C-alpha cells in the first residue's frame, strides 16, 4: 500500500520539516519524476533548489530510495550536491545546490555550440562519471536535461533519481531504467548491464550538442527504442560539419558492444578533450547572455 511505502521511506530520509527553514518556493521546471523549485533559506536569504516527487505518480516507486541513500554526503566539483531529503505528506523533497545557469537543454535547443564548448561539457561529465563509476554508481539518465550550469559556466551533473549502485557481489543491474532516446542498446536488450550504459547515453548527448536533438526524436518512444535496439549506431545529421577529432571521440562512445565501448577513465585521455575551453567559454551560451 501507499502508506506502507510512505512509512518505509520515512525511515531513510532526514527527520523534520524543510518548510520551517525554507520559504518563497518558485517552480522553475518539471521532469519525469516531479518538479524543481527555487527556495530561499529563511535565515540567510540564500537560494537553494528543491525537487519534489509525488509518491503516487512514479512509474517505479521503489526507485525513490536510490538517490536519497546513494548520493548522501557525496561531494564532487562536477556533481550537484544533495544536502537533505524529507518526506512531506505524499511527496519526497530533496534539497540541493542551486545551479543558477540552468540546464544544457536550453542551450542545445536555441544555440549552436562549438567544439571547444562541447569538449568542455564532455570533460566535466567524464570527470564526474569516472569517480562515480569507480564507486559503482550508475547514473542511468545522462542527457542534456541532467547537465546544469553555474553563472560562470561551470558544468555539474544532476538528476540522479534513476541512479543505481552495483557491487562486487551484484556487479550488474537489469531494470529497464532511463529516457527512451538516450538508452543503451544492451540495457534495452536486457543484458545484465553496468556503468557502460552511461557512456552510450553521453554519446547521444553529444548528438544533441551537434544536431540539436537525439536520434529518432520524432518517433514514438517505444518505436525509437526498437530502432535503437535493432539498428547500427546512429549517425550525426551534421556529420559533414564536425572535426575528425569529434567523430573519432564519438566512435568510442557509440559502440554497440559494451565490452568494446570506451570507459570514462579511458576517454579522459582522448585528444578531443584537448579542445576543452575553460568555464568562461561556456558563459556566452546561456540565455541571459546571448
Amino acid at each position: 500500500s501507499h502508506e506502507q511505502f510512505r512509512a518505509a521511506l520515512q525511515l531513510v530520509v532526514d527527520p523534520g520539516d524543510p518548510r520551517s527553514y525554507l520559504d518563497n518556493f518558485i517552480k522553475i521546471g518539471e521532469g519525469s519524476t516531479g518538479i524543481v523549485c527555487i527556495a530561499t533559506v529563511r535565515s540567510s536569504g540564500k537560494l537553494v533548489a528543491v525537487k519534489k516527487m509525488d509518491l503516487r505518480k512514479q512509474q517505479r516507486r521503489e526507485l525513490l530510495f536510490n538517490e536519497v541513500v546513494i548520493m548522501r554526503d557525496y561531494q564532487h566539483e562536477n556533481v550537484v550536491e544533495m544536502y537533505n531529503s524529507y518526506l512531506v505528506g505524499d511527496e519526497l523533497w530533496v534539497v540541493m545546490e542551486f545551479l543558477e545557469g540552468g540546464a544544457l537543454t536550453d542551450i542545445v535547443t536555441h544555440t549552436r555550440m562549438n567544439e571547444e564548448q562541447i569538449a568542455a561539457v564532455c570533460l566535466a561529465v567524464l570527470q564526474a562519471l569516472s569517480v562515480l563509476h569507480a564507486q559503482g554508481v550508475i547514473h542511468r539518465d545522462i542527457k542534456s536535461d541532467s547537465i546544469l550550469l553555474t553563472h560562470d559556466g561551470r558544468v555539474k551533473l544532476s538528476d540522479f533519481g534513476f541512479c543505481a549502485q552495483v557491487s562486487k557481489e551484484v556487479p550488474r543491474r537489469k531494470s529497464l531504467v532511463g529516457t527512451p532516446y538516450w538508452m543503451a542498446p544492451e540495457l534495452i536488450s536486457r543484458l545484465p548491464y553496468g556503468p557502460e550504459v552511461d557512456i552510450w547515453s553521453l554519446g547521444i548527448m553529444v548528438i544533441e550538442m551537434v544536431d540539436g536533438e537525439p536520434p529518432y526524436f520524432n518517433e514514438p518512444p517505444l518505436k525509437a527504442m526498437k530502432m535503437i535496439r535493432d539498428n547500427l549506431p546512429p549517425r550525426l545529421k551534421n556529420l559533414h560539419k564536425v572535426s575528425p577529432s569529434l567523430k573519432g571521440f564519438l566512435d568510442r562512445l557509440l559502440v554497440r558492444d559494451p565490452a568494446q565501448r570506451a570507459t570514462a577513465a579511458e576517454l579522459l585521455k582522448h585528444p578531443f578533450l584537448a579542445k576543452a575551453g575553460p568555464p568562461a567559454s561556456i558563459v556566452p551560451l546561456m540565455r541571459q547572455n546571448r
Side-chain angles (χ1 to χ4, degrees), residues 2 5 9 32-34 53-58 60-67 92 140 160-165 173-178 187 190 193:
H2 174 60
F5 187 78
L9 188 61
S32 54
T33 60
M53 284 72 62
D54 193 312
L55 270 55
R56 301 164 294 170
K57 300 187 191 313
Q58 303 300 310
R60 202 182 158 199
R61 188 169 70 180
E62 27 289 336
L63 289 182
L64 295 172
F65 283 100
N66 286 333
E67 178 179 12
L92 175 62
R140 301 199 299 195
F160 280 77
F162 292 170
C163 72
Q165 178 75 63
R173 307 305 303 179
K174 66 90 161 188
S175 303
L176 193 69
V177 170
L187 166 31
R190 316 303 304 282
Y193 64 80

Side-chain angles (χ1 to χ4, degrees), residues 38-58 60-74 76 78-111 113-167 169-171 173-222 224-225 227-233:
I38 307 181
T40 296
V41 178
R42 292 181 65 196
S43 65
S44 64
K46 179 167 170 180
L47 302 187
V48 293
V50 184
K51 60 172 174 180
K52 306 181 178 185
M53 284 72 62
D54 193 312
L55 270 55
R56 301 164 294 170
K57 300 187 191 313
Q58 303 300 310
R60 202 182 158 199
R61 188 169 70 180
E62 27 289 336
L63 289 182
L64 295 172
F65 283 100
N66 286 333
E67 178 179 12
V68 296
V69 176
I70 297 172
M71 301 303 287
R72 195 187 297 154
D73 301 318
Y74 195 95
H76 186 276
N78 296 118
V79 178
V80 170
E81 196 174 347
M82 176 182 68
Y83 300 134
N84 286 286
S85 66
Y86 307 95
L87 180 61
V88 184
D90 291 317
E91 296 175 339
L92 175 62
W93 290 20
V94 177
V95 183
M96 309 172 294
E97 181 187 358
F98 175 50
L99 275 283
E100 66 281 346
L104 187 66
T105 305
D106 185 68
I107 289 167
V108 306
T109 60
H110 294 286
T111 80
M113 296 179 67
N114 66 40
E115 293 192 3
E116 175 179 25
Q117 293 162 334
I118 296 174
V121 170
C122 294
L123 175 62
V125 174
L126 287 166
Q127 285 175 346
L129 294 177
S130 68
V131 174
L132 285 161
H133 288 174
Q135 296 188 20
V137 181
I138 313 168
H139 186 281
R140 301 199 299 195
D141 205 9
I142 297 295
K143 59 187 177 169
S144 66
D145 313 60
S146 307
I147 305 315
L148 303 185
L149 302 176
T150 69
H151 73 100
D152 62 328
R154 295 178 276 126
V155 170
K156 304 201 183 195
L157 187 54
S158 200
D159 262 328
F160 280 77
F162 292 170
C163 72
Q165 178 75 63
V166 295
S167 61
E169 296 80 25
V170 184
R173 307 305 303 179
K174 66 90 161 188
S175 303
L176 193 69
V177 170
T179 303
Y181 309 96
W182 291 262
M183 305 183 188
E186 78 277 21
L187 166 31
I188 290 183
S189 305
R190 316 303 304 282
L191 284 53
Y193 64 80
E196 310 82 17
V197 300
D198 285 342
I199 302 309
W200 178 278
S201 298
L202 177 53
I204 303 300
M205 198 177 78
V206 172
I207 296 187
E208 287 189 83
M209 291 187 279
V210 174
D211 287 351
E213 53 175 45
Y216 317 118
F217 200 53
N218 293 313
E219 303 289 354
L222 286 176
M225 293 171 75
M227 294 171 197
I228 294 154
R229 189 190 69 207
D230 296 326
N231 306 345
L232 295 89

Side-chain angles (χ1 to χ4, degrees), residues 268 270-289:
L268 286 169
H270 197 278
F272 174 67
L273 300 184
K275 296 182 185 291
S281 72
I282 297 295
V283 171
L285 293 168
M286 284 178 287
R287 182 173 286 281
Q288 63 278 6
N289 301 320

